[PDB]
């Protein structure tokens, strides 16, 4: 197996696990492989010469493949999914295209509201990431074709599957869950807004996701994510 080295940002001391869901995205991709890998946080302030010289153009988060420096998120998630493939490693694309697509406008939603200093818009905006996470709600409720006519007691016609997709984490949950979680904890310490607890389908979903390894130790703590927003959501 080629080298595989990931560089992600580093936090507010210039080391620890930062507010970087770029990077914890493709910590969770290649988690969920099982391939061997390392990671190394970068302190952009302090860069060391090994990481100017594999990547000069300073973009974050990189890749390094055996010789080979990969930048763009989203092109080194395809680029891993393609080459860490079937027999060796299990593939992580979703089934469902609508999975890769759920709950993709809420982060907007929130860095509107998060932002905003007009007090006329506030309810607006509240309601718009309200809306846009309902939205999410109502897809994790659906069931999905694999749960075509099953049935669960008091609960008919309603998803009981644990993640986007099914019941195991995809390339769909690796992309959303950071940025959700950054919405709320950043809302819930600044605004005191919190997703509804009659968003069931929401609640469950990151009941079950906040408890896998996969997200849990790729985190940053809730400190550090309320520190890198102080100066916006103030």
């Given amino acids: 197996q080629p080298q595989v080295e990931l560089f992600v940002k580093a936090g507010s001391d210039g080391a ?11 910590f969770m991709v290649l988690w969920l492989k099982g391939v061997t890998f390392n990671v190394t946080t ?5 860069r060391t010469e090994t990481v100017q010289k594999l990547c000069p153009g300073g973009q ?7 010789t080979e420096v990969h930048t763009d998120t989203n092109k080194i998630e395809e680029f891993l999914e393609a080459v860490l493939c079937p027999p060796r490693y299990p593939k992580l694309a979703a089934l469902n295209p609508e999975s890769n697509t759920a709950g993709l406008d809420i982060f907007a939603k929130f860095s509107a509201y998060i932002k905003n200093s007009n007090p006329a818009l506030n309810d607006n905006l509240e309601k718009g990431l309200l809306k846009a996470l309902k939205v999410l709600d109502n897809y994790l409720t659906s069931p999905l074709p694999e749960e075509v006519d099953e049935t669960s007691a008091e609960d008919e016609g309603v998803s009981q599957r644990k993640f986007l997709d099914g019941n195991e984490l995809t390339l769909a949950d690796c992309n959303l ?18 997703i509804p607890e009659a968003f069931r389908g929401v609640h469950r979903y990151l009941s079950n996701a906040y408890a896998r390894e996969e997200f849990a130790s790729t985190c940053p703590d ?7 927003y102080e100066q916006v959501a103030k």
């Fill in 16 to 26: 620890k696990i930062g507010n970087a869901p770029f990077s914890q995205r493709l």
């Fill in 42 to 46: 970068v302190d952009t302030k302090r």
């Fill in 60 to 66: 974050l988060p990189f890749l390094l493949y055996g």
């Fill in 177 to 194: 869950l950071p940025k959700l979680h950054i919405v709320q904890v950043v809302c819930k310490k600044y605004r005191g807004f919190t």
């Fill in 222 to 228: 809730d400190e550090e994510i309320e520190l890198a």
